[PDB]
Amino acid sequence: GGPSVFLFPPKPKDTLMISRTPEVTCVVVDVSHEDPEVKFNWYVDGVEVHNAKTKPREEQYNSTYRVVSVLTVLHQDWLNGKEYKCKVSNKALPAPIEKTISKAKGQPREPQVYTLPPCRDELTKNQVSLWCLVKGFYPSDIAVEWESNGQPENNYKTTPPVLDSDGSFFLYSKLTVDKSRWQQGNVFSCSVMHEALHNHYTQKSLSL
Amino acid sequence: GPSVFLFPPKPKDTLMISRTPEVTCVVVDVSHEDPEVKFNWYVDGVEVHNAKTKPREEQYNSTYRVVSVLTVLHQDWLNGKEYKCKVSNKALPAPIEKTISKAKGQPREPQVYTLPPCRDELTKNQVSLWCLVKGFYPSDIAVEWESNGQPENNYKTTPPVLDSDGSFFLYSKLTVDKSRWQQGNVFSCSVMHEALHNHYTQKSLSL
Ligand SMILES: *[C@@H]1O[C@H](CO[C@@H]2O[C@@H](C)[C@@H](O)[C@@H](O)[C@@H]2O)[C@@H](O[C@@H]2O[C@H](CO)[C@@H](O[C@@H]3O[C@H](CO[C@@H]4O[C@H](CO)[C@@H](O)[C@H](O)[C@@H]4O[C@@H]4O[C@H](CO)[C@@H](O[C@@H]5O[C@H](CO)[C@H](O)[C@H](O)[C@H]5O)[C@H](O)[C@H]4NC(C)=O)[C@@H](O)[C@H](O[C@@H]4O[C@H](CO)[C@@H](O)[C@H](O)[C@@H]4O[C@@H]4O[C@H](CO)[C@@H](O)[C@H](O)[C@H]4NC(C)=O)[C@@H]3O)[C@H](O)[C@H]2NC(C)=O)[C@H](O)[C@H]1NC(C)=O
Ligand SMILES: *[C@@H]1O[C@H](CO[C@@H]2O[C@@H](C)[C@@H](O)[C@@H](O)[C@@H]2O)[C@@H](O[C@@H]2O[C@H](CO)[C@@H](O[C@@H]3O[C@H](CO[C@H]4O[C@H](CO)[C@@H](O)[C@H](O)[C@@H]4O[C@@H]4O[C@H](CO)[C@@H](O[C@@H]5O[C@H](CO)[C@H](O)[C@H](O)[C@H]5O)[C@H](O)[C@H]4NC(C)=O)[C@@H](O)[C@H](O[C@@H]4O[C@H](CO)[C@@H](O)[C@H](O)[C@@H]4O[C@@H]4O[C@H](CO)[C@@H](O)[C@H](O)[C@H]4NC(C)=O)[C@@H]3O)[C@H](O)[C@H]2NC(C)=O)[C@H](O)[C@H]1NC(C)=O
């Protein structure tokens, strides 16, 4: 079979919040017992970097090894579209495998953020749905959360971003809670994090 | 050797007796040595005699693409009959078999609401009209817009999104000229789904 390489980006929230630590993760699977050594080289815009942290290989339940290398990235490097390449060498390969990742090309556009009460018809159910519209953003990378009185909610589903005709993206998030609370008048908050926002963050609330 | 992928028919094609719903068997990476590809189709075991094979197709990456298309009875697909593509090639280790069928479970009727342009867009050249469609099952659905019978096309629709009760929702966004909205033109969001009466419903709005 021969090894395979997957290269994963940082989470958008981690590149947008200076307090978080964004990482790019290069994962090698199907490493054989006969040729277990795996070498990583990393490059940032084709210049070799030497600060990645590579973990000991780990035997999987199918008897092949998985080996992961992690490169921490500067938030502003990632946001300035630098390109991260992982090159993986292994004696079982005819040649080194390379993977490159970077954020989405294109000019950024600031999302417009709106919230919406439950469909008035829903106003007798066990539960109600709260909506958050996010539209006109570019690039597609974004995080959307819900909180109440500074507490992370979690019963929400968010559509993927949808490419709009204008080249910008939109999506909706739908938080579902107890009928009680919305009348009770608790205040719910939709949080959006995106590179084209001021402080990369904005939040819209609503209640009864 | 080559890969097999087997694709369902389109939701709309199953819901309107005037349309011709098809399952579609695609083979990639067919070389020239054994360009020889055979298909057998079966519905719920019983073999049937009507699939059609396309004129085949080359990618400049050095290989072919060979498609067999079988037309289905609408009611059969909707009742969940299984559809099997059996693919034979003098270049495969063994012949490959794929089954597909409609998502299982009790159909649930969508709820459709249209919503007017936001807030601040009225200063713009253009406005967005919205259609929310929620609570449906299975996820096979078609959503379309029109104005005075005329179909629009300047609209985009999120994919179905799985909700926590195991039903689905989506939104569709139609972009129009501020001028067309303001003259009180009527816009309609149309939804086709097996759990609706006549598989069809339409919701309207205007200034
Ligand atoms: C040489 O090149 C070949 C061709 O490349 C292209 O060719 C042209 C165009 C050229 O310009 C090139 O630039 C192009 O790259 C290579 O062929 C490609 O092979 C790969 C596999 O290696 C294919 O990938 C698969 O894609 C399907 C999705 O289906 C397609 O969508 C893509 C993207 O849109 C598209 O490319 C194809 O067109 C397919 O589109 C659909 O086709 C159907 C077929 O008819 C259309 O439906 C029909 O439409 C009609 C009218 O349109 C009627 O209505 C009819 O009724 C209807 O049926 C439909 O319009 C169209 N849809 C869309 C959206 O476009 C993947 O799903 C598929 O499975 C995957 O499997 C992976 C593992 O193998 C997995 O990791 C993935 O997640 C995925 O799914 C998983 O896998 C399991 C097993 O498969 C599943 O069981 C399971 O669900 C799931 N896993 C889990 C855990 O859930 C696969 O990835 C690729 O599409 C090929 N491209 C083309 C154009 O055919 C070739 O490889 C290469 N060779 C070499 C040697 O280098
Ligand atoms: C033997 O075992 C190993 C290991 O498996 C385990 O053990 C076995 C015994 C069994 O028990 C398993 O159940 C166990 O899991 C098997 O290894 C597996 O190998 C397959 C390939 O054969 C890989 O499949 C790929 O998967 C990726 C998706 O990645 C993730 O998501 C899954 C869950 O869905 C996870 O299980 C994975 O771990 C991985 O999870 C992500 O991991 C990253 C890295 O850590 C995390 O990111 C970091 O997170 C940090 C915090 O945690 C921080 O945020 C960091 O900054 C961040 O970097 C993620 O958070 C985490 N995500 C999740 C949800 O957990 C999938 O993308 C691959 O996708 C495809 O590529 C294939 C080619 O195979 C194409 O067919 C498809 O198109 C598809 O995508 C396209 O691919 C092309 C390139 O080919 C790409 O360029 C295009 O962009 C794509 N196209 C499009 C249109 O988009 C592929 O499916 C498994 O990932 C791997 N598992 C593990 C655990 O590594 C091995 O296969 C077995 N061997 C044998 C012989 O059987």
CA–chain centroid gap for A67, Å, is 22
Q: Is the CB of A100 under 6 A from ligand 2?
A: no
* 3-state SS assignment for residue A168: coil
Chain B 77-116, CB below 8 Å of chain A: which residues? 111, 113
Place of tokens 């597909």: B100
Please answer yes or no on whether A172 and B171 come within 8 Å at the CB atom. yes
The Cβ of residue A21 has, within 10 Å, a number of other Cβ atoms equal to 12
Q: Which residues line ligand 1 (CB under 6 A)?
A: B 3, 5, 7, 9-10, 22, 24, 26, 28-29, 59, 61, 63, 65
Mutate to test the pocket of ligand 2, among A6, A14, A71, A73 (most ligand atoms within 8 A of CB): A6
Pairing, β A23-31 against β B161-162: unpaired
Closest Cβ–Cβ partner in A112, A162, A176 for B164: A176
CA–CA dist A89, A99 (Å, integer) = 12
DSSP reduced 3-state for A103: coil
Q: What is the DSSP letter of A11?
A: P
Q: Return the structure tokens found at A99.
A: 């993977």
What backbone torsions phi and psi does residue B97 show, to the nearest 5 degrees?
A: -120, 125
Tell me the residue type at A201: Y
- Cβ-contact B185, B147 below 8 angstroms: yes
Regarding the beta carbon of A64 and ligand 2, being less than 6 Å apart is answered yes
| Look-up of token digits 């009527």 | B186
Element (H, E) at A14: helix A12-16
Chain B environment of A134 (Cβ under 8 Å): none
Q: Which residues neighbour A115 within 8 Å (Cβ) at sequence distance 6 or greater?
A: A130, A131, A132, A133, A188, A190, A204, A205, A206
Q: What atom of ligand 2 comes closest to residue A24's alpha carbon?
A: 58
Residue with the two structure tokens 């953020």: A113
Residue A85's alpha-carbon distances to A68, A98, A141, B139, in angstroms, are: 14, 7, 20, 38
From B119, B154, B158, residue closest to A159, measured CB to CB? B158
CA proximity to B171, closest of B130, B128, B127: B130
Separation of alpha carbons B30 and B67, rounded Å: 11
CB-based burial label for B136 (10 Å; 0-12, 13-18, 19+): buried
Q: Is residue A129 classed as helix, strand or coil in its secondary structure?
A: strand
**Chain B closest CA to A159's CA: distance in Å?**
6
Spell out the residues 6+ positions from residue B197 whose beta carbon is closer than 8 angstroms to its own. none
Compute, in degrees rounded to 10, the torsion defined by CA atoms A111, B119, B170, A201.
30
Of B169, B202, B174, give the one whose Cα is nearest residue B188.
B202
Domains of chain A by range and CATH? 3-102 (2.60.40.10), 103-208 (2.60.40.10)
Listing DSSP states for chain B in one string gives --EEEEEPPPHHHHH-TTS--EEEEEEEEE-SSS--EEEEEEETTEE-S--EEPP-EEETTTEEE--EEEE--HHHHHTT--EEEEEEETTSSS-EEEEE----S--B--EEEEEPPPTTGGGSSEEEEEEEEEEEBSS--EEEEEETTEEP-SEEEPPPEE-TTS-EEEEEEEEEEHHHHHTT--EEEEEE-TTSGGGEEEEEE--
Chain centre to alpha carbon of residue B192: 11
The answer to whether A170 contacts B170, with C-beta atoms less than 8 Å apart, is no
- From chain A, the residues in CB contact with B169 under 8 A are 157, 174
Any idea which ligand is nearest the CA of A65? 2
Q: Tell me how far apart the alpha carbons of residues B72 and B50 are, in angstroms, rounded to a whole number.
A: 10
Closest listed residue to residue A112, CA positions, set A160, A59, A169, A156:
A169
- Element of type H or E holding A170: strand A169-178
3-class DSSP state of A147: strand
**Residue bearing the CA closest to ligand 2, atom 85:** A6
> B106: buried, middle or exposed (CB in 10 Å: 19+, 13-18, 0-12)?
exposed
How far is CA B46 from each of CA A183, B83, B86, B99, rounded to the nearest angstrom? Answer: 57, 10, 13, 13
Which residue type, as a one-letter code, is found at position B62? S
Q: Is A160 an interface residue toward B (CB < 8 Å)?
A: yes
Chain breaks in chain A (C to N over 2.5 A) after: none
Burial class of residue A107 in the structure, from the number of CB atoms within 10 Å of its CB (0-12 exposed, 13-18 middle, 19+ buried): exposed
